[PDB]
Design an enzyme around this catalytic site. Structure first.
Site, PDB file in Angstrom:
ATOM      1  N   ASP A  55       0.841  -1.199   0.000  1.00 38.79           N
ATOM      2  CA  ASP A  55       0.000   0.000   0.000  1.00 38.79           C
ATOM      3  C   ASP A  55       0.874   1.245   0.000  1.00 38.79           C
ATOM      4  O   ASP A  55       2.023   1.217   0.447  1.00 38.79           O
ATOM      5  CB  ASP A  55      -0.945   0.061   1.212  1.00 38.79           C
ATOM      6  CG  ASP A  55      -2.121   1.032   1.002  1.00 38.79           C
ATOM      7  OD1 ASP A  55      -2.677   1.057  -0.120  1.00 38.79           O
ATOM      8  OD2 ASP A  55      -2.517   1.740   1.954  1.00 38.79           O
ATOM      9  N   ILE A  90      -2.709   0.363  13.227  1.00 44.72           N
ATOM     10  CA  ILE A  90      -2.012  -0.721  13.911  1.00 44.72           C
ATOM     11  C   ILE A  90      -1.070  -0.141  14.949  1.00 44.72           C
ATOM     12  O   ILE A  90      -0.433   0.896  14.720  1.00 44.72           O
ATOM     13  CB  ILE A  90      -1.239  -1.567  12.892  1.00 44.72           C
ATOM     14  CG1 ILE A  90      -0.321  -0.629  12.088  1.00 44.72           C
ATOM     15  CG2 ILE A  90      -2.202  -2.247  11.953  1.00 44.72           C
ATOM     16  CD1 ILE A  90       0.565  -1.285  11.077  1.00 44.72           C
ATOM     17  N   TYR A 104      -0.622  -6.691  11.947  1.00 47.46           N
ATOM     18  CA  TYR A 104      -1.878  -7.399  11.712  1.00 47.46           C
ATOM     19  C   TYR A 104      -1.913  -8.803  12.335  1.00 47.46           C
ATOM     20  O   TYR A 104      -2.858  -9.547  12.096  1.00 47.46           O
ATOM     21  CB  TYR A 104      -2.140  -7.474  10.214  1.00 47.46           C
ATOM     22  CG  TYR A 104      -2.664  -6.151   9.728  1.00 47.46           C
ATOM     23  CD1 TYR A 104      -3.966  -5.767  10.009  1.00 47.46           C
ATOM     24  CD2 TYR A 104      -1.849  -5.263   9.035  1.00 47.46           C
ATOM     25  CE1 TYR A 104      -4.441  -4.563   9.610  1.00 47.46           C
ATOM     26  CE2 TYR A 104      -2.324  -4.047   8.630  1.00 47.46           C
ATOM     27  CZ  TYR A 104      -3.624  -3.701   8.918  1.00 47.46           C
ATOM     28  OH  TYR A 104      -4.134  -2.500   8.490  1.00 47.46           O
ATOM     29  N   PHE A 133       7.485   0.351   6.872  1.00 48.04           N
ATOM     30  CA  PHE A 133       6.841   1.580   6.423  1.00 48.04           C
ATOM     31  C   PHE A 133       7.841   2.719   6.442  1.00 48.04           C
ATOM     32  O   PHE A 133       8.533   2.924   7.450  1.00 48.04           O
ATOM     33  CB  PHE A 133       5.688   2.026   7.310  1.00 48.04           C
ATOM     34  CG  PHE A 133       4.483   1.177   7.222  1.00 48.04           C
ATOM     35  CD1 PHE A 133       4.359   0.030   8.027  1.00 48.04           C
ATOM     36  CD2 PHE A 133       3.438   1.544   6.395  1.00 48.04           C
ATOM     37  CE1 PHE A 133       3.226  -0.724   7.980  1.00 48.04           C
ATOM     38  CE2 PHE A 133       2.300   0.774   6.319  1.00 48.04           C
ATOM     39  CZ  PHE A 133       2.192  -0.365   7.126  1.00 48.04           C
TER      40      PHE A 133
HETATM   41  O1  LIG Z   1      -8.095   3.355   7.493  1.00 51.48           O
HETATM   42  C1  LIG Z   1      -7.228   3.155   6.715  1.00 51.48           C
HETATM   43  O2  LIG Z   1      -6.221   2.236   7.033  1.00 51.48           O
HETATM   44  C2  LIG Z   1      -6.612   1.280   7.988  1.00 51.48           C
HETATM   45  C3  LIG Z   1      -5.474   0.990   8.972  1.00 51.48           C
HETATM   46  O3  LIG Z   1      -4.278   0.785   8.261  1.00 51.48           O
HETATM   47  C4  LIG Z   1      -3.194   0.745   9.129  1.00 51.48           C
HETATM   48  O4  LIG Z   1      -3.382   0.645  10.309  1.00 51.48           O
HETATM   49  C5  LIG Z   1      -1.816   0.841   8.550  1.00 51.48           C
HETATM   50  C6  LIG Z   1      -1.084   2.014   9.188  1.00 51.48           C
HETATM   51  C7  LIG Z   1      -1.527   3.298   8.665  1.00 51.48           C
HETATM   52  C8  LIG Z   1      -1.359   3.415   7.223  1.00 51.48           C
HETATM   53  C9  LIG Z   1      -2.233   2.400   6.522  1.00 51.48           C
HETATM   54  N1  LIG Z   1      -1.961   0.982   7.048  1.00 51.48           N
HETATM   55  S1  LIG Z   1      -1.920  -0.330   5.999  1.00 51.48           S
HETATM   56  O5  LIG Z   1      -1.067  -1.393   6.533  1.00 51.48           O
HETATM   57  O6  LIG Z   1      -1.238   0.114   4.788  1.00 51.48           O
HETATM   58  C10 LIG Z   1      -3.603  -0.919   5.715  1.00 51.48           C
HETATM   59  C11 LIG Z   1      -3.588  -1.835   4.515  1.00 51.48           C
HETATM   60  C12 LIG Z   1      -3.474  -1.298   3.231  1.00 51.48           C
HETATM   61  C13 LIG Z   1      -3.480  -2.162   2.145  1.00 51.48           C
HETATM   62  C14 LIG Z   1      -3.577  -3.544   2.323  1.00 51.48           C
HETATM   63  C15 LIG Z   1      -3.725  -4.060   3.611  1.00 51.48           C
HETATM   64  C16 LIG Z   1      -3.719  -3.208   4.704  1.00 51.48           C
HETATM   65  C17 LIG Z   1      -7.211   3.944   5.407  1.00 51.48           C
HETATM   66  C18 LIG Z   1      -6.027   4.103   4.706  1.00 51.48           C
HETATM   67  C19 LIG Z   1      -6.042   4.850   3.537  1.00 51.48           C
HETATM   68  C20 LIG Z   1      -7.240   5.407   3.116  1.00 51.48           C
HETATM   69  N2  LIG Z   1      -8.353   5.230   3.810  1.00 51.48           N
HETATM   70  C21 LIG Z   1      -8.372   4.527   4.926  1.00 51.48           C
END
Ligand SMILES: O=C(OCCOC(=O)[C@@H]1CCCCN1S(=O)(=O)Cc1ccccc1)c1cccnc1
Ligand SMILES: [Mg+2]
Length: 186
Positions: A117, A136, A162, A179
């Protein structure tokens, strides 16, 4: 005549087939272009000594399938929770603090270099309540103490990530996550 070469980032490994008579600048620039980074920002090593872009594989006595290390001092911090972080760029703006809604750009990779992502793909900064349990646990802990302008590399063990279930279609069980987080505003 030709040689195959592997360039490793400690996580990702890319193979290149070039002519031994050619200088390695085209290999370097090609490996740098995939990362979307300028070539000046990466130092390439082979058997220790840094590679100057004027040098060739023959000029360096390279055999088929030898490896080149790629790098950016470096100061990796390990906190009491297992989180690892490294401040690639030190910010000089204000400090990110629990309770603020902070805005960032980020890329997230699996430990094999695979990108899963990025807010940059949609060119859309990401905001969240720091320490509020929206993200997370590795982010709530890892982004505290960043300063606006900073780029921090977070290496998040799975129980700060996760966990044993992972994330549908994309993130395996028990995955360590990497990240690069750039703090835009607090
Ligand atoms: O609500 C969001 O994100 C939800 C928590 O995501 C997370 O806690 C982490 C830490 C913060 C950055 C995002 N991630 S991630 O690993 O890339 C989550 C991920 C992405 C792709 C595949 C699997 C999983 C969100 C993010 C972007 C736009 N609208 C909502
Ligand atoms: Mg946004």
């Amino acid at each position: 005549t030709h040689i195959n070469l592997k360039v490793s980032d400690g996580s990702s490994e890319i193979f290149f087939k070039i002519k031994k008579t050619t200088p390695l600048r085209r290999l370097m620039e090609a490996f740098a272009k995939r990362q979307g980074k300028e070539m000046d920002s990466l130092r390439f090593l082979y058997d220790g000594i840094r590679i100057q872009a004027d040098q060739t594989p023959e000029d360096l006595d390279m055999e088929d399938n030898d490896i080149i290390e790629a790098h950016r001092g470096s100061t990796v911090v390990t906190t009491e929770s297992g989180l690892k972080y490294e401040d690639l760029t030190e910010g000089s703006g204000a400090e990110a603090r629990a309770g603020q809604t902070v805005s960032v750009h980020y890329t997230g990779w699996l430990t094999d270099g695979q990108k899963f992502d990025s807010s940059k793909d949609r060119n859309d900064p990401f905001a969240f309540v720091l320490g509020g349990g929206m993200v997370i646990k590795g982010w709530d802990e890892g982004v505290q103490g960043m300063k606006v302008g900073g780029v921090r590399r977070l290496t998040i063990p799975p129980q700060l990530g996760y966990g044993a279930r992972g994330a549908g279609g994309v993130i395996p069980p028990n995955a360590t996550l990497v990240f690069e987080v750039e703090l835009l505003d607090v």
